[PDB]
Amino acid sequence: SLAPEDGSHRPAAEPTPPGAQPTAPGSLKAPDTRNEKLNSLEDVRKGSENYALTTNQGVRIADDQNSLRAGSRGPTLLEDFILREKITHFDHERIPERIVHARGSAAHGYFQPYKSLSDITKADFLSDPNKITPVFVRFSTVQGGAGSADTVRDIRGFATKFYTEEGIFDLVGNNTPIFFIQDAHKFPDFVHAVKPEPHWAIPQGQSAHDTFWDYVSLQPETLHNVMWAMSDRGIPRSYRTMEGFGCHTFRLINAEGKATFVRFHWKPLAGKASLVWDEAQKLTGRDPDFHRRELWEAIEAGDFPEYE
Amino acid sequence: ISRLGGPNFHEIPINRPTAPYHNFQRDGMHRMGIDTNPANYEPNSINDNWPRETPPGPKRGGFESYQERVEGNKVRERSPSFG
Amino acid sequence: SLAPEDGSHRPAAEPTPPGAQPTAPGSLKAPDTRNEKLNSLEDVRKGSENYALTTNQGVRIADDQNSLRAGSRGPTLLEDFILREKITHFDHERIPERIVHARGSAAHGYFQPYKSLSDITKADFLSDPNKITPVFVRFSTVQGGAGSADTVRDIRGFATKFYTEEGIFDLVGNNTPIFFIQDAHKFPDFVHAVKPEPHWAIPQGQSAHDTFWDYVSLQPETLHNVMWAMSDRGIPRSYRTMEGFGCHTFRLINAEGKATFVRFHWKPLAGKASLVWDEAQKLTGRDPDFHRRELWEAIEAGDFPEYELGFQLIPEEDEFKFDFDLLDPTKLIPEELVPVQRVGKMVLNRNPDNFFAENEQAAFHPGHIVPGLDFTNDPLLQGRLFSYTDTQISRLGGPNFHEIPINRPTAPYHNFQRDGMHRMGIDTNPANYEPNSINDNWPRETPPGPKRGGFESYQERVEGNKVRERSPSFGEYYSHPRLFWLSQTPFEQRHIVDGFSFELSKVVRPYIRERVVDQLAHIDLTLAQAVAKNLGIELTDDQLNITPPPDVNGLKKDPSLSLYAIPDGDVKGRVVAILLNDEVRSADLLAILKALKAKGVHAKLLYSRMGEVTADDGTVLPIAATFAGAPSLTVDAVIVPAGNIADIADNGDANYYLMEAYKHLKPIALAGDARKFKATIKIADQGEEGIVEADSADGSFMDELLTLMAAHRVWSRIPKIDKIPA
Amino acid sequence: SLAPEDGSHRPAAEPTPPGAQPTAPGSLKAPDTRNEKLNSLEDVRKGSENYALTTNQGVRIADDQNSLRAGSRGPTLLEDFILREKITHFDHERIPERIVHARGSAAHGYFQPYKSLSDITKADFLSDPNKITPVFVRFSTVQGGAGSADTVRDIRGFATKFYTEEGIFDLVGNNTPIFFIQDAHKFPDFVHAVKPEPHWAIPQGQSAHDTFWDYVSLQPETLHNVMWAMSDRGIPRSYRTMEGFGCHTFRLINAEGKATFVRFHWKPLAGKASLVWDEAQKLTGRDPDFHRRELWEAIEAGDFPEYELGFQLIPEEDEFKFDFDLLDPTKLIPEELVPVQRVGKMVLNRNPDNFFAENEQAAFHPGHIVPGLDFTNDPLLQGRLFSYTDTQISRLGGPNFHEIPINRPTAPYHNFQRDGMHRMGIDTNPANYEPNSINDNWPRETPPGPKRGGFESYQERVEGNKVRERSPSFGEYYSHPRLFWLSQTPFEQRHIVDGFSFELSKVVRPYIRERVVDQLAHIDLTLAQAVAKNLGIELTDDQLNITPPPDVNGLKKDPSLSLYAIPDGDVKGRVVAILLNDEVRSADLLAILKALKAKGVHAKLLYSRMGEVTADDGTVLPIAATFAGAPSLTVDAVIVPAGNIADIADNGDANYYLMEAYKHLKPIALAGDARKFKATIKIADQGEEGIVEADSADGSFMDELLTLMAAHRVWSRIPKIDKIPA
Ligand code: HDE
Ligand code: HDE
Ligand code: HDE
Ligand SMILES: [S]
Ligand SMILES: [S]
Ligand SMILES: [S]
A39 is a catalytic site residue: no
Nearest to D66 among B72, B78, B80 (CB): B78
A101 is a catalytic site residue: yes
Closest CA to C163 of C265, C40, C250: C40
* Contact partners, residue D547, CB within 8 Å, separation at least 6: none
β-pair partners for C604: C577
Nearest 5°: the CA angle B37, C186, C479 is 120
Ligand found nearest the CA of A244: 1
Please give the C-alpha separations between residue C470 and each of C221, C378, D143, in angstroms, as whole numbers: 12, 11, 57
Coil vs helix vs strand at D105: strand
- Indicate whether residue C187 lines ligand 5 (CB < 6 A): no
DSSP codes of every residue in C450-480? SSSPPB-----EEEEEEE----GGG---SHH
Q: B1 near B29, Cβ under 8 Å?
A: no
CA distance linking residue D116 with residue D129, whole number of Å:
6
Coil vs helix vs strand at C169: strand
Q: For the beta carbon of residue D199, count every other beta carbon within 10 angstroms.
A: 6
Which residue among C328, C377, C387, C407 is best mutated to probe the pocket of ligand 2, counting the most ligand atoms within 8 A of its Cβ? C387
Which residue among D105, D155, D384 is best mutated to probe the pocket of ligand 3, counting the most ligand atoms within 8 A of its Cβ? D384
Residues in chain B closer than 8 A to C457 (CB atoms): 74-76
CA distance linking residue C495 with residue C135, whole number of Å:
35
Q: D605 near D652, Cβ under 8 Å?
A: no
Q: Compare all CA atoms of chain D with the CA of C70 and give the residue at the minimum distance.
A: D462
Closest CA to D346 of D166, D134, D157: D134
CA distance linking residue C465 with residue D337, whole number of Å:
86
- Indicate whether residue C574 lines ligand 2 (CB < 6 A): no
Nearest 5°: the CA angle C604, C610, C612 is 80
DSSP codes of every residue in D385-399? HHHHHHTHHHHTSST
CA distance linking residue D266 with residue D340, whole number of Å:
10
- The closest-lying atom of ligand 3 relative to the alpha carbon of residue D106 is 28
- Distance, in angstroms, between C169 CA and closest chain B CA? 22
CA distance linking residue C573 with residue D144, whole number of Å:
66
CA distance linking residue D243 with residue D230, whole number of Å:
16
Q: Compare all CA atoms of chain B with the CA of C467 and give the residue at the minimum distance.
A: B67
DSSP structural state of residue D357? I
Q: For the beta carbon of residue B38, count every other beta carbon within 10 angstroms.
A: 24
Q: C296 near C24, Cβ under 8 Å?
A: no
- Indicate whether residue D101 lines ligand 3 (CB < 6 A): yes
Long-range contacts of C607-613 (CB under 8 A, 24+ apart): C607/C579, C607/C580, C607/C581, C608/C648, C608/C651, C608/C653, C608/C654, C613/C580, C613/C581, C613/C582, C613/C583, C613/C584
Chain centre distance of CA D532: 32
CA distance linking residue A281 with residue A274, whole number of Å:
13
Please give the C-alpha separations between residue A41 and each of B36, B38, C509, C590, in angstroms, as whole numbers: 12, 18, 30, 71
CA distance linking residue D332 with residue D325, whole number of Å:
10
Please pick, among A108, A174, A225, A291, the residue that the annotation labels catalytic: A174
- Indicate whether residue D364 lines ligand 3 (CB < 6 A): yes
Please give the C-alpha separations between residue C324 and each of A73, C225, C252, C315, C461, in angstroms, as whole numbers: 13, 16, 21, 16, 21
Interface contact A25-B39, CB threshold 8 A:
no
Residues in chain C closer than 8 A to B64 (CB atoms): 468
Interface contact B74-A71, CB threshold 8 A:
no
Closest CA to C314 of C293, C287, C333, C295: C333
Residues in chain B closer than 8 A to C470 (CB atoms): none
CA distance linking residue A202 with residue A196, whole number of Å:
4
Q: What is the CATH number of domain A24-308?
A: 2.40.180.10
- Distance, in angstroms, between A20 CA and closest chain D CA? 45
**Total residues found in chain C within this entry:** 726
Closest CA to C580 of C485, C492, C655, C644: C644
**CB-based burial, C236-254: b 16+ in 10 Å, e otherwise:** bbbbbbbbbbbbbbbbbbb
- Distance, in angstroms, between C561 CA and closest chain A CA? 28
Q: Supply the residues of D annotated as catalytic.
A: 101, 174
**C426, amino acid identity:** I
Where in chain C is CATH 2.40.180.10? 24-409
DSSP codes of every residue in C612-643? EEE-TTS-EEE--EETTTS-GGG-SEEEE--S
Residue A295, judged by CB atoms within 10 A of its CB (0-12, 13-18, 19+), counts as buried
- Distance, in angstroms, between B69 CA and closest chain C CA? 4
Q: C621 near C580, Cβ under 8 Å?
A: yes
DSSP structural state of residue A97? P
Nearest to C468 among A24, A63, A91 (CB): A63
* Contact partners, residue A238, CB within 8 Å, separation at least 6: A270, A273, A291, A294, A295, A298
Residues in chain B closer than 8 A to A50 (CB atoms): 50
Mutual orientation of helices A277-286 and C277-286 as an angle, nearest 10°? 120
**D421, amino acid identity:** M
Nearest to B75 among D65, D72, D94 (CB): D72
Q: How, if at all, do strands C306-315 and C340-350 pair?
A: antiparallel
CA distance linking residue A235 with residue C243, whole number of Å:
39
Please give the C-alpha separations between residue A169 and each of A156, A163, A258, B83, in angstroms, as whole numbers: 20, 7, 20, 68
CA distance linking residue C329 with residue D30, whole number of Å:
57
- Indicate whether residue C143 lines ligand 2 (CB < 6 A): no
DSSP structural state of residue C360? I
- Indicate whether residue D363 lines ligand 3 (CB < 6 A): yes
- Distance, in angstroms, between A105 CA and closest chain C CA? 8
DSSP structural state of residue C163? E
Selected residue of B25, B45, B46, B77 to mutate for chain C interface (largest C Cβ count, 10 A)? B45
What is the A100 CA–ligand 4 centroid distance (Å)? 14
**C671, amino acid identity:** A
* Contact partners, residue C314, CB within 8 Å, separation at least 6: C249, C260, C261, C262, C326, C333, C338
Please give the CATH superfamily to which domain C573-726 belongs: Class I glutamine amidotransferase (GATase) domain (3.40.50.880)
Ligand found nearest the CA of D142: 3
Please give the C-alpha separations between residue A305 and each of A132, A268, A300, D307, in angstroms, as whole numbers: 17, 8, 11, 69
What values do phi and psi take at A44, rounded to 5? -110, -5
Coil vs helix vs strand at D301: helix
Find the discontinuities in chain D where C to next N exceeds 2.5 angstroms and give the residue preceding each. none
Which amino acid residue places its CA nearest to atom 1 of ligand 6? Answer: D247
Q: Compare all CA atoms of chain A with the CA of D75 and give the residue at the minimum distance.
A: A77
* Contact partners, residue D719, CB within 8 Å, separation at least 6: none
Residue C422 falls in which region: left (phi positive, over 0), alpha (psi -120 to 50) or beta: left
* Contact partners, residue C646, CB within 8 Å, separation at least 6: none
Please give the C-alpha separations between residue A51 and each of B51, C215, D447, in angstroms, as whole numbers: 5, 20, 69
Interface contact A28-B39, CB threshold 8 A:
no
Q: C369 near C160, Cβ under 8 Å?
A: no
Which amino acid residue places its CA nearest to atom 43 of ligand 3? Answer: D384
Alpha helices in C174-333 (DSSP H): 187-194, 210-218, 223-230, 277-286, 290-301
CA distance linking residue D574 with residue D667, whole number of Å:
12
Please give the CATH superfamily to which domain C469-572 belongs: Catalase, four-helical domain (1.20.1370.20)
Residues in chain B closer than 8 A to A53 (CB atoms): 22-24, 42, 51-54
Helix, strand, coil shares of chain A as percentages rounded to 5? 30, 20, 55
Q: C555 near C331, Cβ under 8 Å?
A: no
- Indicate whether residue D370 lines ligand 6 (CB < 6 A): no
Closest CA to C195 of C144, C153, C159, C231: C144
* Torsion angle defined by CA atoms of residues A224, A230, A234 and A236, in that order, rounded to the nearest 10 degrees: -130
Q: D571 near D601, Cβ under 8 Å?
A: yes
Which residue among A98, A162, A266 is best mutated to probe the pocket of ligand 1, counting the most ligand atoms within 8 A of its Cβ? A98
Where in chain D is CATH 1.20.1370.20? 469-572
Find the discontinuities in chain B where C to next N exceeds 2.5 angstroms and give the residue preceding each. none
Method used for this model?
X-ray
Nearest to C468 among B2, B41, B65 (CB): B65
Q: Supply the residues of C annotated as catalytic.
A: 101, 174
Q: A61 near A55, Cβ under 8 Å?
A: yes
Q: Compare all CA atoms of chain C with the CA of D89 and give the residue at the minimum distance.
A: C399
Preceding peptide of C435 cis, ω within 30° = yes
Where in chain D is CATH 3.40.50.880? 573-726
**CB-based burial, C626-664: b 16+ in 10 Å, e otherwise:** ebbbbbbbbbbbbbbbbbbbebbbeeebbbbbbbbbbbb
- Indicate whether residue D565 lines ligand 3 (CB < 6 A): no
CA distance linking residue C456 with residue C443, whole number of Å:
18
Q: How, if at all, do strands C104-113 and C340-350 pair?
A: antiparallel
Coil vs helix vs strand at C712: coil
Q: For the beta carbon of residue A260, count every other beta carbon within 10 angstroms.
A: 12
What is the C142 CA–ligand 2 centroid distance (Å)? 9
Q: For the beta carbon of residue A293, count every other beta carbon within 10 angstroms.
A: 18
What values do phi and psi take at C7, rounded to 5? 70, 15
**CB-based burial, A182-213: b 16+ in 10 Å, e otherwise:** eeebbbbbbbbbbbbbbbbbbbbbbbebbbbe
Q: Compare all CA atoms of chain A with the CA of C69 and give the residue at the minimum distance.
A: A183
**D650, amino acid identity:** D
CA distance linking residue D637 with residue D705, whole number of Å:
8
Alpha helices in D472-545 (DSSP H): 479-486, 490-505, 510-523, 525-534, 541-544
Chain centre distance of CA D431: 45
Coil vs helix vs strand at C307: strand
Selected residue of A1, A2, A69, A284 to mutate for chain C interface (largest C Cβ count, 10 A)? A69
Q: D118 near D139, Cβ under 8 Å?
A: no
CA distance linking residue D25 with residue D303, whole number of Å:
17
What values do phi and psi take at C369, rounded to 5? -110, 175
CA torsion sign for C691, C696, C700, C701 is: positive
**CB-based burial, A89-98: b 16+ in 10 Å, e otherwise:** bbbbbbbbbb
* Contact partners, residue C270, CB within 8 Å, separation at least 6: C238, C240, C241, C305, C306, C570, C572, C573
CA distance linking residue A140 with residue A101, whole number of Å:
6
* Contact partners, residue C294, CB within 8 Å, separation at least 6: C238, C239, C240
Which chains sit next to C, with 3 or more Cβ pairs under 8 A? A, B, D
Coil vs helix vs strand at A243: coil
CATH class of D24-409: mainly beta
Does residue C511 have a known ligand-binding role? no
